[PDB]
């Protein structure tokens, strides 16, 4: 319901969608050749089929083609600075595909807006929907137009006859929350019966280890998940089932 929507919001009012408690199959995302730009930051594409996270955040918008390279950490640009920033330690996925067939009108489409001027930069994750006029001079505007005073928002104006430079592009970004809470989003892998007193290799919610399991009378805190006494090695685990 997110990769097939009829209409997408403007880049200045992007809407985020949260996804949790479901079994995901990312293969159909990377098997298909429809997408033009498919980038991953911090995680290999295939290995996503064997990982579990706590929640997934999806953001979607539409922008011109020449700026598809700007959506990346560390870059600077008008939309990158004034509309959508990225943290320097981002991990996730970025998908971008051409949508000239869905957002083009013969007379010109004027349903998309983008911000031109702003006093300062934004934080890595922020949203700006203020309609207050921007003042570049010294004389107060008093809510009216004038010299050195302009309306911030500006239109794009897509046309079907334009070249690849001005053609629209639909962009979605996926972010994961991990190493913070017990897993909620899972991958398709059927479980297996347990072993009590034998040395085996185990895979608990994506955490891979080797050794022998046992039952201990440890007063584990009910709201906690697992512990590590020292040397950054887990020793106590809780079975999800």
């Amino acid at each position: 319901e997110v990769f097939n929507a009829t209409r997408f919001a403007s880049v200045y009012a992007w809407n985020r969608k949260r996804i949790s408690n479901c079994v995901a199959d990312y293969s159909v995302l990377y098997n298909s050749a429809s997408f033009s730009t498919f980038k991953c930051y911090g995680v290999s594409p295939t290995k996503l089929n064997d990982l579990c996270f706590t929640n997934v955040y999806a953001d979607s918008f539409v922008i011109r083609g020449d700026e598809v390279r700007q959506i990346a950490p560390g870059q600077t640009g008008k939309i990158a600075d004034y509309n959508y920033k990225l943290p320097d330690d981002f991990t996730g996925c970025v998908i971008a595909w051409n949508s000239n067939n869905l957002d083009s009108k013969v007379g010109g489409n004027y349903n998309y807006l983008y911000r031109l001027f702003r006093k300062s930069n934004l934080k890595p994750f922020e949203r700006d929907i203020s309609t207050e006029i921007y003042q570049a001079g010294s004389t107060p505007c008093n809510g009216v137009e004038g010299f050195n005073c302009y309306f911030p928002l500006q239109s794009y104006g897509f046309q079907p006859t334009n070249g690849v430079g001005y053609q629209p592009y639909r962009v979605v970004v996926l972010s994961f929350e991990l190493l913070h809470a017990p897993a909620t989003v899972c991958g398709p892998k059927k479980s297996t019966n347990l072993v009590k007193n034998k040395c085996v290799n185990f895979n608990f919610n994506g955490l891979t280890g080797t050794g022998v399991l046992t039952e201990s009378n440890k007063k584990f805190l009910p709201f906690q998940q697992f512990g590590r006494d020292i040397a950054d090695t887990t020793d106590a685990v809780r079975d999800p089932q």
């Epitope: 957002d103 083009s104 009108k105 013969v106 079907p160």
Partner: antibody
């Protein structure tokens, strides 16, 4: 002033083949979506599929996938609709509609082709 | 999947009366609605292409409103030639969208 003209009403029998056409004039045929709608006597409507002739992109409703086929021809500015094997539950009225996917869809329709099947 | 409903199924009103019809949705659709009218034995015609925006070439006596899960269509002053069948169609996902059930409007004399 645009005009959509369909093909004549048809009668067939089970086990045969069929083809239906729809022609548009008065505008640039390569810049608008063409969709197909059906109505069975006495009941409501139900979309079947849509097609974009320029890039030649076809999309189908989940209920009617594989039982029909939709294609377009930009040389004569025409759209088609094809079957594989008819049965006793394919008699209906069909319309071809012109639309565009940002503001208005369903601006102009056709006449309505009537397809009958029996033995 | 999304299913819709209309109410009332059929109603009768006199000339010059005010008529209202309600379209209800299973879940949120965010003002993605279209209103269709079909006279007996003809092809449908567009009436309102959004929650409120009015199509060109339509008499001004028609109006529409609503949001969320409830939408209303109102006819202010009825006229003799306004006997037809009315439909409300939602369009959210790329191609799964469906019509309603239908409504019949009559006139007594």
């Amino acid at each position: 002033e645009v005009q959509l003209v369909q093909s004549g009403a048809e009668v067939k029998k089970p086990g045969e083949s069929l083809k239906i056409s729809c022609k548009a004039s008065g505008y640039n045929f390569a810049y608008y979506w063409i969709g197909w709608v059906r109505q069975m006597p006495g009941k409501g409507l139900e979309w079947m599929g849509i097609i974009y002739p320029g890039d030649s992109d076809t999309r189908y409703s989940p209920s009617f996938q594989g039982q029909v086929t939709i294609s377009a021809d930009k040389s004569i500015s025409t759209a088609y609709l094809q079957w594989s094997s008819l049965k006793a539950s394919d008699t209906a009225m069909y319309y071809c509609a012109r639309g565009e996917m940002t503001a208005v869809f369903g601006d102009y329709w056709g006449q309505g082709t009537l397809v009958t099947v029996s033995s | 999947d999304i299913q819709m409903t209309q109410s009332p199924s059929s109603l009768s009103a006199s000339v010059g009366d005010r008529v209202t019809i309600t379209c209800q949705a299973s879940q949120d659709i965010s003002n993605y609605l279209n209103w269709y009218q079909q006279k007996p034995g003809k092809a449908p015609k567009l009436l309102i292409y959004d929650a409120s925006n009015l199509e060109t070439g339509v008499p001004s006596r028609f109006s529409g409103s609503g949001s969320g899960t409830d939408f209303t269509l109102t006819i202010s002053s009825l006229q003799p030639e306004d006997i037809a069948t009315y439909y409300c169609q939602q369009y959210k996902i790329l191609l799964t969208w469906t019509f309603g059930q239908g409504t019949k409007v009559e006139i007594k004399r």
